[PDB]
Design a protein around this nucleic acid. Structure first.
Length: 70
RNA sequence: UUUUUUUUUUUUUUUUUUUUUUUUUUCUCCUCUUUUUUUUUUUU
C-alpha cells in the first residue's frame, strides 16, 4: 500500500484500479492476511480496540516478496 | 624226611597389583546448440 504511490495500485490488465483475492484463505497466504484485516475492519467500526498487533511495513514487504518467490 | 629272614603310596601353604572406543595416505579431471528467460486472468 502506502509504501508506494497511488499510480502503482492499479490492475490495468483487468481495467480495475485495485484487485486482490479474498476467495481462498486455505490454499494461499495473502488471503489469511486479508481475513485478519477484513475482520479487524468489521470489528473496528464500533469505537473499540483490537488487542494484538497486526503487521508492519517491513514485515509485509518481506512477506510479499516471499510469496512472489513461492 | 625240605627250616629261618628280606620296612613303605613327596614334605609345604594364611599371595600385593592404582585402566578405557579408535589407531596409519593415493593426483589433476571439455556437461553439445530456437531464444530473449515466460509471467494478468478464472475455475482446486
Amino acid at each position: 500500500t502506502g509504501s508506494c504511490a497511488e499510480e502503482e495500485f492499479h490492475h490495468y490488465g483487468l481495467a480495475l484500479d485495485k484487485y486482490t483475492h479474498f476467495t481462498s484463505p486455505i490454499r494461499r497466504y495473502s488471503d489469511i492476511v486479508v481475513h485478519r484485516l477484513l475482520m479487524a475492519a468489521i470489528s473496528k467500526d464500533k469505537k473499540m480496540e483490537i488487542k494484538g498487533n497486526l503487521f508492519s511495513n517491513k514485515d509485509l514487504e518481506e512477506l510479499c516478496r516471499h510469496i512472489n518467490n513461492r
